[PDB]
Design a protein around this ligand. Structure first.
Ligand SMILES: [Cl-]
Ligand SMILES: [Cl-]
Ligand SMILES: [Cl-]
Ligand SMILES: [Cl-]
Ligand SMILES: [Cl-]
Ligand SMILES: [Cl-]
Ligand SMILES: [Cl-]
Ligand SMILES: [Mg+2]
Ligand SMILES: [Mg+2]
Ligand SMILES: [Mg+2]
Ligand SMILES: [Mg+2]
Ligand SMILES: [Mg+2]
Ligand SMILES: [Mg+2]
Ligand SMILES: [Mg+2]
Ligand SMILES: [Mg+2]
Ligand SMILES: [Mg+2]
Ligand SMILES: [Mg+2]
Ligand SMILES: [Mg+2]
Ligand SMILES: [Mg+2]
Ligand code: NA
Ligand code: NA
Ligand code: NA
Ligand code: NA
Ligand code: NA
Ligand code: NA
Ligand code: NA
Ligand code: NA
Ligand code: NA
Ligand code: NA
Ligand code: NA
Ligand code: NA
Ligand code: NA
Ligand code: NA
Ligand code: NA
Ligand SMILES: [Sr+2]
Ligand SMILES: [Sr+2]
Ligand SMILES: [Sr+2]
Ligand SMILES: [Sr+2]
Ligand SMILES: [Sr+2]
Ligand SMILES: [Sr+2]
Ligand SMILES: [Sr+2]
Ligand SMILES: [Sr+2]
Ligand SMILES: [Sr+2]
Ligand SMILES: [Sr+2]
Ligand SMILES: [Sr+2]
Ligand SMILES: [Sr+2]
Ligand SMILES: [Sr+2]
Lengths: 49, 142, 150, 142
RNA sequence: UGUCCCAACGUUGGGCCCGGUGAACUGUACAUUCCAGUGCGGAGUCUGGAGACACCCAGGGGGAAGCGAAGACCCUAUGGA
RNA sequence: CGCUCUAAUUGGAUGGAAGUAGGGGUGAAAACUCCUAUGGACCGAUUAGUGACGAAAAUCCUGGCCAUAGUAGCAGCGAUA
RNA sequence: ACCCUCAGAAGGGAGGCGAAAUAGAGCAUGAAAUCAGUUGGCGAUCGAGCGACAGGGCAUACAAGGUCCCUCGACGAAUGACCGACGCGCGAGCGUCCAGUAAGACUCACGGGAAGCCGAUGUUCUGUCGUACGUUUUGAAAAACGAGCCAGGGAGUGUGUCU
């Protein structure tokens, strides 16, 4: 759930801004966002044997 | 009273005629810079080479003036490729034992930068006695 | 903060510095530029004349909208930055003071080196229309001065 | 005011364009040329159509400006400028070592360049630079 | 009856110059342009000419198909309400 | 070719490691390497592996910063001080 | 610490400590963007994808590169003469012989020379070519879309099954 604990939403078109989820004026959740989730991180379910 | 470099500083390797010829060719022909397209137009774009991939790229399309594109045809002569300009083949050395098996007539030695002064002194005096030139010699005031 | 950016022979030189002064950085470049090479005493008289309004300071770089001044030589735009001038008078006061304490003829020394450097901004915020606020800052300026025997 | 010309060309009864072409050629080869008797230079064709063309050039213009010369002096020099890359260093240099004159300010007579001569006994459809200038409204100072 | 013929003079606050304070919009790059042409047919940047010494102040806004808003019109989506 | 960490084999470092800056050499190239200054404690090579492994771009994200600019505003309200 | 300066517990100067204060308080290192001062090159008559490749100017402590230039001679691929003689053409000019000769890129040897001198690096000038990049597109310099600049961040991953 790292990076997913936020209700951040995108404003969409209109304010001359990239459609990126934001909360309190901060971009969040998405992989390109600082403090966002890891896109393809190490996973516990992976069989390493 | 003046700085002097240790070792066989002026030593030259002995090359077959064909090798001296090819070494001379490489040096005369040279090659283009081969820097990345438009690296000069944007600071965030470094000089390190990257194949131009734009569908419309002028360099990719091979337009005269946009610089040469890396191709095998630019390779240097096999017989000389990699040689130090002096003609010597270089051998990376980290200690005195690395000097073993090195032919001073054909190879010159390059002491890794990490190596300290104490160990460099030993390596430098052992290479000279072995008739091996050291490309990056220590300068002492003699 | 800065460090003197030029070498100085202690035996024939005297130094001084201003720190984090809240004054126009742009005015400081203009003033430094104008007094360099002058004598401490000449610089002082010059700056007093600027504050008095009898001598304009050439504004050669930060000159947009600035009106021409007949007394400006070789250039057109100039002004009378009294605030930054007074700060430079404190610098010269300190400099010449140090110079004399060392046995030199303070006022007589040449301003060998003098340069202003922007060390930062004291940040401020100003409420604007439409529920937004924008920057309203103060420049922070360091300035170095090296006096040297003729 | 004194012009050490290596060559003094006499444009009298000579086809302007043909002289201009040779003076440009020589100027580019480093020669300093003085064209004399410009008002007497000549241009073949119907006087009425020739003048219309030069009148159109006088009328063209705007704020940016299209300053076209009216004196035979300048007409000829502009003609030469059109055969020189006057905006290039070498071209401006050549052009600047060329001068045209009304009458002959020299004591030495000019020479008639081969192939540029017009024979009045065999031609009737031609005009004179002086005539053109007068029509254009120039002040016949020559 | 200054809405108009047809505009004038005046008043107060700005505007302009000086001290202090001191933002924002906008910025691929280059950029002194003009006339024609060409080009995905609506070019400061391509071609040909023309013009062009650098910098600065004030101005009214012709152009940058100016800036501001992933066109609201129209159609399309095995979209929504 | 380059990056991380693991293992085996094997090396470098306070007689100055990594990093950074400027500079020399090699390689078609990814990139490798040396010199000098700074720095003041760690750093490789080969082989077999491991992978949150390579950016110029997404009106991409966050931080920092320049031009804009000593520019707009600090006048306008029946309360001109 | 002490002293000097100052309206001054500010700041500055000098000084003391320590291997180091360019370790003096968001105080290990200290990139880029970018700012001040300054060095080299260019610069107030001249033109715009900012360069690539050639070639000139000017600039250069050492180290890590050491070459380069001129006479002559040797070798000498494709190519390839002048002149002279003879013979044709109205003419421009051509043919035959001289002759596949002289010449001919590179490379080398002898003799002489250069050390800012050769390379290289900075900048500038000349020549040739040249209207970014990525994307959308039949067609992009585009008056189609994206970005102010830099640094860092930023996209084929796991389980199961199948082939
Ligand atoms: Cl290969
Ligand atoms: Cl500022
Ligand atoms: Cl005109
Ligand atoms: Cl030209
Ligand atoms: Cl006739
Ligand atoms: Cl060869
Ligand atoms: Cl993939
Ligand atoms: Mg995270
Ligand atoms: Mg770049
Ligand atoms: Mg103004
Ligand atoms: Mg409100
Ligand atoms: Mg839309
Ligand atoms: Mg509708
Ligand atoms: Mg519905
Ligand atoms: Mg091994
Ligand atoms: Mg990265
Ligand atoms: Mg890309
Ligand atoms: Mg403005
Ligand atoms: Mg620090
Ligand atoms: Na939360
Ligand atoms: Na597992
Ligand atoms: Na200026
Ligand atoms: Na003046
Ligand atoms: Na004046
Ligand atoms: Na004619
Ligand atoms: Na005209
Ligand atoms: Na009225
Ligand atoms: Na306008
Ligand atoms: Na944006
Ligand atoms: Na050069
Ligand atoms: Na697109
Ligand atoms: Na494009
Ligand atoms: Na277009
Ligand atoms: Na901004
Ligand atoms: Sr909309
Ligand atoms: Sr080292
Ligand atoms: Sr300015
Ligand atoms: Sr000719
Ligand atoms: Sr043009
Ligand atoms: Sr206006
Ligand atoms: Sr990644
Ligand atoms: Sr700013
Ligand atoms: Sr008031
Ligand atoms: Sr108001
Ligand atoms: Sr001290
Ligand atoms: Sr031969
Ligand atoms: Sr970045």
């Amino acid at each position: 759930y790292a990076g997913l604990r936020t209700p951040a939403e995108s404003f969409g078109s209109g304010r001359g801004q990239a459609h990126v989820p934001k909360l309190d004026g901060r971009a969040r959740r998405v992989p390109q966002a600082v403090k966002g989730r890891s896109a393809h991180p190490p996973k516990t379910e992976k069989d390493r044997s | 009273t003046e700085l002097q470099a240790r070792g066989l500083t002026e030593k030259t390797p002995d090359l077959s005629d064909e090798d001296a010829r090819l070494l001379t060719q490489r040096h005369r022909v040279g090659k283009p810079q081969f820097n990345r397209q438009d690296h000069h137009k944007k600071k965030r774009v470094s000089t390190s080479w990257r194949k131009p991939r734009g569908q419309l790229s002028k360099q990719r399309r091979g337009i005269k003036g946009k610089g040469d594109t890396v191709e095998a045809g630019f390779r240097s002569p096999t017989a000389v490729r990699g040689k130090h300009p002096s003609g010597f083949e270089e051998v990376r050395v980290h200690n005195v034992d690395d000097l073993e098996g090195v032919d001073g007539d054909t190879e010159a030695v390059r002491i890794a930068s990490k190596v300290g002064a104490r160990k460099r002194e030993r390596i430098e005096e052992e290479a000279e006695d072995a008739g091996i030139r050291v490309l990056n010699p220590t300068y002492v005031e003699v | 903060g800065i460090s003197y950016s030029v070498e100085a022979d202690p035996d024939t030189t005297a130094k001084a510095m201003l720190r984090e002064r809240q004054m126009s950085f742009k005015h400081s470049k203009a003033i430094a530029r104008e007094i360099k090479g002058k004598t401490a005493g000449e610089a002082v008289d010059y700056l007093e004349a600027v504050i008095e309004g009898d001598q304009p300071v050439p504004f050669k770089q930060h000159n947009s909208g600035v009106g021409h001044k007949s007394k400006v030589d070789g250039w057109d735009a100039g002004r009378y930055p009294e605030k930054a001038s007074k700060a430079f008078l404190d610098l010269l006061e300190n400099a010449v003071g140090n110079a004399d304490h060392q046995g030199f003829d303070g006022e007589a020394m040449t301003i060998k080196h003098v340069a202003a450097h922007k060390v930062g901004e004291q940040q401020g915020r100003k409420p604007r229309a439409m529920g937004r606020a924008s920057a309203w800052n103060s420049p922070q300026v360091d300035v170095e001065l090296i006096l040297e025997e003729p | 005011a004194e012009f050490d010309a290596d060559v003094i060309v006499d444009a009298r009864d000579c086809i302007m364009g043909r002289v201009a072409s040779q003076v440009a050629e020589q100027a580019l080869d480093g020669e300093t040329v003085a064209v004399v008797n410009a008002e007497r230079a000549v241009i073949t064709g119907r006087e009425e159509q020739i003048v219309e063309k030069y009148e159109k050039r006088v009328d063209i213009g705007n704020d940016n400006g299209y300053f076209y010369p009216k004196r035979p002096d300048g007409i000829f020099k502009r003609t030469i400028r059109g055969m020189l890359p006057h905006k290039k260093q070498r071209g401006r240099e050549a052009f600047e070592s060329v001068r045209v004159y009304l009458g002959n300010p020299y004591d030495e007579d000019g020479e008639v360049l081969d192939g540029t001569s017009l024979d009045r006994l065999s031609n009737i459809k031609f005009v004179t630079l002086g005539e053109i200038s007068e029509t254009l409204g120039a002040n016949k100072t020559w």
